[PDB]
Symmetry: D2
Subunit: 241 residues, 4 copies
Amino acid sequence: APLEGQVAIVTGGARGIGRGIALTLAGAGANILLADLLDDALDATAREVRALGRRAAIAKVDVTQAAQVDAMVAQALADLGGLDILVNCAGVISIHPVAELTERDWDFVMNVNAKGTFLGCRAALAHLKAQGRGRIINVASIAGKEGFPNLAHYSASKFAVVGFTNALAKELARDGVTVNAICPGIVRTSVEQSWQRHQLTLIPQGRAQTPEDMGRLALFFATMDNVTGQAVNVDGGFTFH
Amino acid sequence: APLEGQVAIVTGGARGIGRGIALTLAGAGANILLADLLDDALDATAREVRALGRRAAIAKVDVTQAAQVDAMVAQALADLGGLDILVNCAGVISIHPVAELTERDWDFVMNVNAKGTFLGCRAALAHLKAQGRGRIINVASIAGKEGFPNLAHYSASKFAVVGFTNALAKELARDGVTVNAICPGIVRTVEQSWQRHQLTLIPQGRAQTPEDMGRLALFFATMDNVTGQAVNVDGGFTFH
Amino acid sequence: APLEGQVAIVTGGARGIGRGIALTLAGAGANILLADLLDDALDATAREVRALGRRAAIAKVDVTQAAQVDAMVAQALADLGGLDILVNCAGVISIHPVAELTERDWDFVMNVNAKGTFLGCRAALAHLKAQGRGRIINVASIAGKEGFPNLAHYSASKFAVVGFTNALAKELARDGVTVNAICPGIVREQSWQRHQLTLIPQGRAQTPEDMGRLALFFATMDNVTGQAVNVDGGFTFH
Amino acid sequence: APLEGQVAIVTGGARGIGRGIALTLAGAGANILLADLLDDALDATAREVRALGRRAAIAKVDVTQAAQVDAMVAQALADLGGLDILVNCAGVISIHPVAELTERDWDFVMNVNAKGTFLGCRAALAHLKAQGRGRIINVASIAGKEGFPNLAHYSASKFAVVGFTNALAKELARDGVTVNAICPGIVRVEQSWQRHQLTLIPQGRAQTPEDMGRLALFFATMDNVTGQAVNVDGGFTFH
Ligand SMILES: [Cl-]
Ligand SMILES: [Mg+2]
Ligand SMILES: [Mg+2]
């Protein structure tokens, strides 16, 4: 249990990739604050964390709202007695050519994916810096490494996360806090399904990656003092940049 | 005059890098619509375009406002009779550690730098696609290739522009429209001290100029088979 | 013991980064074939692998020589009963401006760092592909991501490893074999290293154990391939 | 004529991409030393340079041989009276999976593409440095940005050129010499491969020697661009 005695916050932690990361960190010894917008899913995943022998707390958090993000950090400290790892895994996606993108489409993806990550990171800094050790783990995407047609807004938001991660890493490099990004390739969940199915043919391994894969990378960052500023692809070979 | 008969819109075109790009493209034969928020500067740069023998139009445009950006495209078509090149060169910057960044700081830089570029590109698509040829040129930054401490928000916005550029390039690759980014290194104007220190980090040890950026803009505007690229003009600071 | 029952070859495994990787993989359950040119160091590191409760084999290998590299793979199959992981960690460096580089300087670094990695990978390929499972792990450098002045030949060789890695990963992507690179930053010529630490945001060197941790990650990640991951305190992220 | 009075060496300059670059630089005012192994092609291309009103010199050069590369640089100084631009555009390719690659395959591609570029650059340094101005332009490939399956050796060699370019740019950054790379996409067994690679080009068409010459002219006239490796590839990669 490398993470015994530690506390992790996972935004978007109730399902999909966030759940995978939470359950992996919990398996490795961390108590978890799950932050999401899905009430039943939060409860279910909390039960799974507890089934691993860990403590779990839940927060209803819209990551675009600074007050909710601050309260989330305050709750980890109050309910679980600390904070060591912040995983920003809240994310939204839609598929439209730029010609068909509305301002709402643009703002939604940029605000949740990029601004939400900024707000989460900012909220955790004072505590992590004061304790002289911490792990910030942002979940971007391979769409943060390559521009995807009909996902230009989503790519912009994920590129933003990659760049934000690297810059913040450099700010905190002498503070004992590492900052890294996980870049998932295709993690399964119709236009979206048809798109997903086609993208798999472009993956050299020809198969999707899993939430558990992402959790393994999160656990690696969480236990590597000398890795910071990186954006690592878990994508079956699609890109290596 | 490689761009003879063509029309370019340059947002942020009244001063700095935008002006440099505008005057380079005008020197190369293009008539220019200058879009910015500075009235006297717009007038002055318009006079410089006309002094080169070109026609110039001016628009007062807040690139965060879609209606103004649409009107801008409409004005190039109405006043100058067409549109061939769109240069998105509106940009803002501030220096703060993330711990000191406000939401206003984040939103200002992201909305001007990234959303403004999205809105500009979107407004020009219908026309450029219809005529089967076009050049979209986004001005990012080397901060779109490397995260800069105390500029994390600025880096996010410029990374966004690089990614957006590449994605849009792929959407338009069979439409005859190329989409590329210019990534300036250090182009002069806390800010001064920061600028001065960054120069020591440039292998050539000197700043780059608006004219350098204009030369890259002219290259993109005259290269059919280059698209999706983000080329650094930065004295060797980064090559990614 | 995630690597229980598996066999790893580690070239350059007698000392430094190679040794760190060998000991991490051995700690995680792998039996190790150590390949190097240092006899006493080979014996000492073999004893350390055995002290971890693992079996160890030793091969005297010049990685620029295909016959030796091929025999190394054959020895793993014969002495340890199989092969699951190949770590190419033989590497050499010298510091000269291009103006002062000799052909010998160029060929030495390119043959050891790049051609040696090609030969190792090629030698292990048939077996890993036939069994439908395998891990190939190349040790490049951050100098494979950024050109270093007075190290242009060294950068050329490590860029070559990064590109070779990605290409081979794509060839084997449907064969159950992953191919990845470890890119160490500065692992404690001495004056140069001290000067390079100014370029590391964390302001400290990385360790052979750090690299061993990344090797263990690659060795246990089915769905990561073609990657070149930097362990470098923030120096580069490309 | 932005390059009026200047002298350029173009290795591999007798045909293909090298020829395109030579003619663009000559068109822009430079006198040219063409270095290659093709006798008839060298003569033909030299006549084309002279038809542009420029002077042309010819050298029979194997870029893997240091003495020949040194003689090439000396010939530019002696025959054309100077040297301002070096274009390293000698290049070879073959297609084999790693499982089928021979040492001969590996060495051929690495020695010509990478070592030949090292040798070309090294031979020109003393002169370019002494005059405080110069342009070194290496021709890599998009295979120097992405690993290509069945071209692992070729990718290795072109990745090497990209890294070498960036490193050398940093050595010379205060010497008035810029060092950059041109990365061509697909420029028209090899033919079948090319046809398949076009599926990977967003624009769906190949690029031309003239495209590469245009980028060469750009580098040759941009003081403040150095260390870069710019892709001319219809959108295949932007890294
Ligand atoms: Cl699948
Ligand atoms: Mg501290
Ligand atoms: Mg059309």
